[PDB]
RNA sequence: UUUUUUUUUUUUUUUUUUUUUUUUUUUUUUUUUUUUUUUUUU
């Protein structure tokens, strides 16, 4: 398209994920359940492909019967459109929903047990995670979880570090997480004042499985030089 | 019935699909209009059919091959890319595996039919690796996509072909997912991976003495 | 061959047509979206397209679509590259007039090619705007900067050389290349070590920690 | 969309000699250096155009002359059967390169005229010029590899330098590696007719690779 | 066989490089005798 517009922009983000989250709970909270989040997280790659080929700057997406108004910045032309502070992109929505699950799971053993039986995080799994490793690590794998380092006990930060180190993830992608804040204070503040917690959580994820695999044998293909 | 609506739905363990049942239903429906010309046409225009079905948005695109019309389920459109396929019904892959199975069975029972199939049907996935009908119909037809559904009928060749593709091309080992959970007759994978290692090594050896690299008469000076 | 195109004659004609609609917001928008618009043109099979930046419509010859790579461009015609040069020239001339207007320019216009290297408005409008594509058409206006950045891009960054073709045949006022790459050999070298003082190119975010590993 | 039917099977080497002569029969009478000059200017453009339209056969005009061309450039037509003695854009270029080459060698004066009209931008970009000789200069034309003997192995060796200097995909050299040299097959001449190939290699090796003014001198006065 | 790369000359043209933020985008996406992705002849 042949029309180009401003796009005023400053330094300092006005976006505070904590306020965005609460606005999201305000709008959709009464409609959420684990089935709705279950559908979101298995169809999240698919919805992104839809949005990538869809030429409206905002789209109504329905996951498990609940309809969400989503800002579409995936379609190439829209990649630099401004997003309101209380609007949800696919990425933001994913982080909010992960945070909602964790807020529901932190409270009660019963809610944890049902979340664990219904909700699948394809991203955690392929690294050998499972609900067994605790809700904060498993849900910390969600896109957008890096907006809540406090709620996910630093896991999204160190999960990304490990992705640069063990996988060959473009060293970008870490751009966002490195300027997120932690509960109280800014990055420069938690970068060394919470270094002990971070090194601890780095270690926790560091003792997770590889986990490039699919069942024994395995013993079979090794026999043929793998 | 709307790319903007996602459900719901369902999980997801245990496959019900039995290739042997699906094959007989496929022969039941289309058997009488099958001949080597129809098969010829399919295998030459598979890949193109994969590219075309890829872009078209109906869950069952009706394809005609060699003047024969087939009711084809389509999961290639990258949004039907998951979507329930009945135990009878064919995608393109299933239809290739059937056909492959059908040719091999027709060849099994008749040397004369073998000669006719040898003259008409081309498997370009086999050819580029230097595999000819001369290497035996179970190997040559074992290159057909979907042949891995019938490990018994193609003497494990689909399996070993894929091992060689992992080893000398750099095929993502995750392409072997399907074949490593197929059956060999009634035997589950877990069982033939141990019990049938000798035949599998024989098939491996074997496909391993076929011609590869680029196309490569005897090139020198440097490469 | 000899080139008929005089950027000075193109520039005045560009202002004759569009000047009454121009302002620093329109320029701000052009330079933010210059890359985007190039990619748009590369995909569109019209030999001429109307592009709107900041509400202002420009009729732009499209030689970006591969087939049109060697269609002849009229001398009063406007390609994306030429328009970038002309807008940059116009900003510069407006800034000369008063150090106000220059204040205005400094707050609204962004040169992303200049950024990325440590160049900013604080390093002087001639050096900042010299990073704009097409500025090489006016070496006089930009104190040779477009030439000298590019030399620095040939060796810092591995720019192919050969992109340097256009600038080495540009004029300097009425002085031809042969002549200025001799008679102005001094002021050019001076411009060289001056851009040499920027962040020579690049680790944008740290090195405020990370370095448990990388 | 609809399927379909077979196409073939199998090739040989379609004999370019036979194709060339058929081509020289049909158009070889309307051909002149102005028409050839124009072809080798708009060859790239022509195949960019031949690529958009859905006609398996098109009439193109070079220097006021109209040519029947099979269109396998349009993605769908890529694997269409081309006849022996029908011309694609590649084949036409090869035939027109072979023509000119047979006119030069046959006489001086024609060599002079060909030098003044014919421009081979593929050759020029390597700093190859008419002064390096008509077999090397015209060898840069697409379809020259079709006549390895007429172009003294240059199309083969030119490809080798494209693999080694420029980052060409090598699979582009699959066709030349199956061409003939005179009466000898490819398995023969990559043994029986070396020395020539080594000579051609070094001969085109001795070329530049593009090269503006000198300055040079001033770029050299800074860095190169 | 065929297609895909390379396309002279100029104060032409094209190819490269494209801020900023607790923005945005690009990476990684469970499970099955399921499905999708790779490989397609002279």
Short mmCIF file of C-alpha atoms in Angstrom, two decimals, chain C residues 6-163:
data_model
loop_
_atom_site.label_atom_id
_atom_site.label_comp_id
_atom_site.label_asym_id
_atom_site.label_seq_id
_atom_site.Cartn_x
_atom_site.Cartn_y
_atom_site.Cartn_z
CA UNK C 6 21.63 17.99 -13.62
CA UNK C 7 20.43 17.48 -10.02
CA UNK C 8 20.24 21.30 -9.60
CA UNK C 9 17.70 21.58 -12.43
CA UNK C 10 15.79 18.54 -11.11
CA UNK C 11 15.81 20.02 -7.60
CA UNK C 12 14.30 23.38 -8.59
CA UNK C 13 11.61 21.62 -10.66
CA UNK C 14 10.80 19.31 -7.71
CA UNK C 15 10.23 22.39 -5.51
CA UNK C 16 8.22 24.04 -8.28
CA UNK C 17 5.76 21.12 -8.19
CA UNK C 18 5.70 20.03 -4.54
CA UNK C 19 7.29 22.84 -2.51
CA UNK C 20 4.04 24.55 -1.54
CA UNK C 21 3.01 21.30 0.28
CA UNK C 22 6.32 20.47 1.99
CA UNK C 23 7.13 20.62 5.70
CA UNK C 24 9.25 18.78 8.29
CA UNK C 25 6.51 16.27 9.13
CA UNK C 26 6.24 15.21 5.48
CA UNK C 27 10.01 14.77 5.40
CA UNK C 28 9.96 13.01 8.77
CA UNK C 29 7.57 10.46 7.30
CA UNK C 30 9.45 9.96 4.03
CA UNK C 31 12.72 9.09 5.78
CA UNK C 32 11.09 6.70 8.27
CA UNK C 33 9.35 4.80 5.46
CA UNK C 34 11.89 5.07 2.65
CA UNK C 35 12.84 1.40 3.00
CA UNK C 36 9.23 0.27 3.16
CA UNK C 37 8.27 2.25 0.03
CA UNK C 38 11.20 0.79 -1.92
CA UNK C 39 9.96 -2.74 -1.12
CA UNK C 40 6.44 -1.71 -2.16
CA UNK C 41 7.72 -0.39 -5.52
CA UNK C 42 9.82 -3.50 -6.05
CA UNK C 43 6.63 -5.60 -6.03
CA UNK C 44 4.32 -3.35 -8.10
CA UNK C 45 4.13 -3.63 -11.90
CA UNK C 46 3.21 0.01 -12.61
CA UNK C 47 6.03 2.01 -14.26
CA UNK C 48 4.83 5.06 -12.28
CA UNK C 49 3.14 5.11 -8.87
CA UNK C 50 1.55 7.76 -6.67
CA UNK C 51 2.99 7.52 -3.16
CA UNK C 52 1.57 9.50 -0.25
CA UNK C 53 3.89 10.56 2.62
CA UNK C 54 2.54 12.69 5.48
CA UNK C 55 -0.66 13.41 3.47
CA UNK C 56 1.32 14.66 0.45
CA UNK C 57 1.05 12.72 -2.83
CA UNK C 58 4.15 12.31 -5.07
CA UNK C 59 4.14 10.72 -8.54
CA UNK C 60 7.21 8.51 -8.50
CA UNK C 61 8.82 6.67 -11.41
CA UNK C 62 9.20 2.98 -10.51
CA UNK C 63 12.49 1.48 -11.70
CA UNK C 64 12.53 -0.86 -8.65
CA UNK C 65 10.28 -3.48 -10.23
CA UNK C 66 12.98 -5.73 -11.85
CA UNK C 67 11.62 -5.41 -15.41
CA UNK C 68 11.85 -1.58 -15.23
CA UNK C 69 15.46 -1.45 -13.99
CA UNK C 70 16.63 0.16 -17.25
CA UNK C 71 13.66 2.24 -18.31
CA UNK C 72 14.83 5.80 -19.07
CA UNK C 73 13.97 8.37 -16.39
CA UNK C 74 13.05 11.89 -17.56
CA UNK C 75 15.38 14.59 -16.18
CA UNK C 76 12.55 16.38 -14.35
CA UNK C 77 11.25 13.03 -13.08
CA UNK C 78 11.27 11.83 -9.52
CA UNK C 79 12.43 8.43 -8.36
CA UNK C 80 12.53 7.50 -4.67
CA UNK C 81 16.28 8.00 -4.64
CA UNK C 82 16.07 11.44 -6.27
CA UNK C 83 13.27 12.57 -3.98
CA UNK C 84 15.32 11.51 -0.95
CA UNK C 85 18.18 13.70 -2.28
CA UNK C 86 15.91 16.67 -2.99
CA UNK C 87 14.14 16.50 0.41
CA UNK C 88 17.50 16.27 2.17
CA UNK C 89 18.78 19.28 0.13
CA UNK C 90 15.63 21.21 1.02
CA UNK C 91 15.96 20.53 4.76
CA UNK C 92 19.60 21.68 4.62
CA UNK C 93 18.76 24.90 2.74
CA UNK C 94 15.96 25.63 5.25
CA UNK C 95 18.42 25.11 8.14
CA UNK C 96 20.99 27.52 6.65
CA UNK C 97 18.35 30.27 6.61
CA UNK C 98 17.95 30.25 10.40
CA UNK C 99 19.17 28.31 13.46
CA UNK C 100 15.47 28.25 14.20
CA UNK C 101 13.86 25.97 11.63
CA UNK C 102 17.07 24.05 12.33
CA UNK C 103 15.78 23.59 15.91
CA UNK C 104 12.50 22.39 14.37
CA UNK C 105 14.22 20.04 11.93
CA UNK C 106 16.30 18.56 14.76
CA UNK C 107 13.23 17.52 16.78
CA UNK C 108 11.14 16.04 13.94
CA UNK C 109 13.43 14.51 11.28
CA UNK C 110 15.13 11.16 11.86
CA UNK C 111 17.80 9.68 9.61
CA UNK C 112 17.95 5.98 10.54
CA UNK C 113 20.99 5.35 8.34
CA UNK C 114 22.75 8.15 10.29
CA UNK C 115 21.61 6.65 13.56
CA UNK C 116 23.03 3.09 13.82
CA UNK C 117 26.27 4.88 13.27
CA UNK C 118 26.65 7.31 16.19
CA UNK C 119 25.67 10.31 14.03
CA UNK C 120 23.06 12.73 15.40
CA UNK C 121 21.80 16.27 14.81
CA UNK C 122 24.36 17.41 17.40
CA UNK C 123 27.15 16.45 14.94
CA UNK C 124 25.87 19.15 12.56
CA UNK C 125 23.09 19.09 9.97
CA UNK C 126 25.42 18.60 6.98
CA UNK C 127 26.86 15.36 8.39
CA UNK C 128 23.54 14.03 9.66
CA UNK C 129 21.65 14.68 6.41
CA UNK C 130 24.59 13.51 4.26
CA UNK C 131 23.56 9.96 5.25
CA UNK C 132 20.31 10.32 3.25
CA UNK C 133 20.20 8.40 -0.05
CA UNK C 134 20.63 10.94 -2.88
CA UNK C 135 22.58 13.50 -0.87
CA UNK C 136 25.64 12.52 -3.00
CA UNK C 137 23.90 14.55 -5.74
CA UNK C 138 24.82 17.70 -3.77
CA UNK C 139 28.36 17.24 -2.40
CA UNK C 140 28.56 21.06 -2.24
CA UNK C 141 25.54 21.37 0.06
CA UNK C 142 26.70 18.52 2.34
CA UNK C 143 30.40 19.34 2.75
CA UNK C 144 31.44 16.08 0.99
CA UNK C 145 29.97 13.92 3.81
CA UNK C 146 27.99 11.52 1.52
CA UNK C 147 31.24 10.71 -0.30
CA UNK C 148 33.21 10.16 2.89
CA UNK C 149 30.57 8.07 4.60
CA UNK C 150 30.62 5.22 2.09
CA UNK C 151 34.42 5.18 2.04
CA UNK C 152 33.92 4.34 5.70
CA UNK C 153 31.19 1.89 4.67
CA UNK C 154 33.50 0.25 2.12
CA UNK C 155 36.02 -0.60 4.88
CA UNK C 156 33.91 -0.50 8.04
CA UNK C 157 31.11 -2.84 6.98
CA UNK C 158 32.10 -4.70 3.81
CA UNK C 159 30.17 -2.63 1.27
CA UNK C 160 30.82 -4.04 -2.19
CA UNK C 161 32.83 -1.04 -3.41
CA UNK C 162 31.12 -0.39 -6.82
CA UNK C 163 28.09 1.16 -5.07
#
